[PDB]
Every structure is written in C-alpha cells, then in structure tokens.
Amino acid sequence: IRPTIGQQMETGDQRFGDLVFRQLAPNVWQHTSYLDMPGFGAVASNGLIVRDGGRVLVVDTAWTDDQTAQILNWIKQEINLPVALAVVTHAHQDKMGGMDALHAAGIATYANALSNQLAPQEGLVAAQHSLTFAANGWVEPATAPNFGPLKVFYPGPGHTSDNITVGIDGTDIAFGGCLIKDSKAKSLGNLDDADTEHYAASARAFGAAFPKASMIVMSHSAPDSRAAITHTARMADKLR
Numbered sequence: 649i650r651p652t653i654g655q656q657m658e659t660g661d662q663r664f665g666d667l668v669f670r671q672l673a674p675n676v677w678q679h680t681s682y683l684d685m686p687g688f689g690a691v692a693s694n695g696l697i698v699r700d701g702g703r704v705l706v707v708d709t710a711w712t713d714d715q716t717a718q719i720l721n722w723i724k725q726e727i728n729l730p731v732a733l734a735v736v737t738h739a740h741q742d743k744m745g746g747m748d749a750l751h752a753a754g755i756a757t758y759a760n761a762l763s764n765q766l767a768p769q770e771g772l773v774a775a776q777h778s779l780t781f782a783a784n785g786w787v788e789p790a791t792a793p794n795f796g797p798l799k800v801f802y803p804g805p806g807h808t809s810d811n812i813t814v815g816i817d818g819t820d821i822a823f824g825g826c827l828i829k830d831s832k833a834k835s836l837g838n839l840d841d842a843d844t845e846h847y848a849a850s851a852r853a854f855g856a857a858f859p860k861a862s863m864i865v866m867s868h869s870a871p872d873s874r875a876a877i878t879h880t881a882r883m884a885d886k887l888r
C-alpha cells in the first residue's frame with residue numbers, strides 16, 4: 649500500500665486493483681498508479697479523471713497499459729460513462745506509459761505535438777492528436793476540440809521542454825503534472841531532461857495561468873496549496 653515516492657493511503661482513498669483513486673471535487677478524481685522500481689520501491693504517479701456531464705476526461709495515463717486499463721475499469725465501475733478523451737502532460741512513462749490501453753479502448757488521445765514527436769525517442773507511443781500552443785502558452789482551441797472543462801496550458805520548458813498543465817475550469821483544481829513539486833519537496837525530481845534556465849518562469853507561468861486554483865494536483869505528491877507552485881518556483885530559481 650506504501651510508495652517510496654508519492655502520497656500514502658489516507659481515508660477516502662479508494663484502492664482499485666493496483667491503483668488508488670481520490671475524489672478531489674464532485675467531478676474530479678486523482679488516479680494514482682505505482683511503478684515498482686527494483687530496489688527503490690513504488691513510485692506514485694497521479695493523473696486526473698474529470699466527469700463532464702455524460703463523458704469522462706482523463707489526464708495522464710498510468711505507468712503501464714495494465715494500470716491504465718484498471719483506470720478505465722475504475723471509471724466504468726464508479727462513473728459508468730464513456731471516456732471522451734485523454735490529455736497526457738508530457739512524453740515520459742509516468743504520463744504516457746499506458747497510451748496503448750487508451751487506444752485499444754478507442755479513447756482519443758491528445759498531447760503537446762512536441763510530446764508526440766518525443767514519444768518515440770522516449771520509448772513511448774504518441775497520442776493520436778497534437779495540441780499546439782499560442783505564444784502565451786494557452787492551447788490553440790482548434791487542436792483541443794470539445795475539451796469541456798480541461799483548460800490546457802503549456803507553461804514553458806521546465807520538467808521537460810514538452811510538459812503541459814491542465815486547469816479544471818469550474819473547479820479550484822489545476823494540474824501541474826511533473827512540472828510542480830509539493831510545498832515541502834526537497835527536490836525538483838528528475839532534472840535530466842529539464843530546462844533549468846526556464847523552469848522557474850514556467851512554474852510561475854502555470855500559477856498565473858490558473859490564478860484562482862487553490863488545489864494544485866501534481867504527478868508524485870498529494871494535491872497541495874499554491875505553495876506547491878511557489879516552492880517549485882523558488883527551488884527552480886536556484887537552478888539559474
């Protein structure tokens with residue numbers, strides 16, 4: 649039950665197969681999957697599940713196809729509405745490891761064009777659709793058709809050059825993915841593929857994109873305050 653990296657079990661977490669689901673809002677769930685790193689233990693990765701009327705929107709895969717299938721299973725059981733689309737927040741295993749499971753389920757997948765271009769080099773499957781972004785980082789609306797409350801924002805390079813973020817419009821929830829670390833984080837996680845020059849501005853950009861989101865959901869920590877953004881940014885300031 650207990651990851652080395654990620655939030656531990658708390659009451660109101662629902663354990664379903666190998667995954668954990670935490671209701672954040674009437675219409676928003678966090679999905680948590682665990683990659684058993686040999687010798688390091690389980691690494692939690694969080695995405696989101698959003699009910700938008702008669703359809704469900706997914707943010708990020710699990711680490712694996714098998715885990716992402718369990719997410720669909722959980723959605724089927726708990727919401728029992730079709731998954732309209734998945735948005736995946738950059739081309740790394742924690743965010744796009746389960747693309748095949750979404751595709752096999754006939755779920756329309758969207759990623760940053762650059763994530764799609766990077767997917768093959770990262771041993772991953774591209775999303776079937778490419779999000780492009782304006783100079784101010786907002787998704788080009790035509791590339792994000794019928795996204796409902798998923799408000800996609802490319803904050804700039806940080807965790808990766810392709811990392812994107814998702815505000816859940818009509819909620820106080822914004823999703824920073826692996827760009828954002830919790831307010832008590834000692835580390836910015838894996839900086840291997842990171843843009844250390846732009847990280848801070850990108851963390852802040854995310855904050856300013858979703859100025860009214862009080863609940864910040866991220867890949868490897870329990871949903872947190874805006875302090876997650878500000879702390880991530882302050883840590884990122886040291887990188888320059």
Ligand SMILES: CC1(C)S[C@H]([C@H](NC(=O)[C@H](N)c2ccccc2)C(=O)O)N[C@H]1C(=O)O
Pocket residue numbers: 653683685691740741742743807826827836837838839867868
């Ligand atoms: C949680 C991480 C430290 S690992 C993860 C990602 N890495 C992977 O998905 C790798 N496939 C992986 C290899 C070994 C152990 C865990 C993940 C990355 O490089 O951002 N995201 C990192 C992050 O968000 O900082």
Ligand SMILES: [Cl-]
Pocket residue numbers: 671672673674
């Ligand atoms: Cl709620």
Ligand SMILES: [Cl-]
Pocket residue numbers: 784
């Ligand atoms: Cl503008």
Ligand SMILES: [Cl-]
Pocket residue numbers: 815857858859860861
């Ligand atoms: Cl906002």
Ligand SMILES: [Cl-]
Pocket residue numbers: 879882883
């Ligand atoms: Cl700090």
Ligand code: NA
Pocket residue numbers: 770841
């Ligand atoms: Na890489």
Ligand SMILES: [Zn+2]
Pocket residue numbers: 738739740807808826
């Ligand atoms: Zn990553």
Ligand SMILES: [Zn+2]
Pocket residue numbers: 693742826837867868
């Ligand atoms: Zn990550």
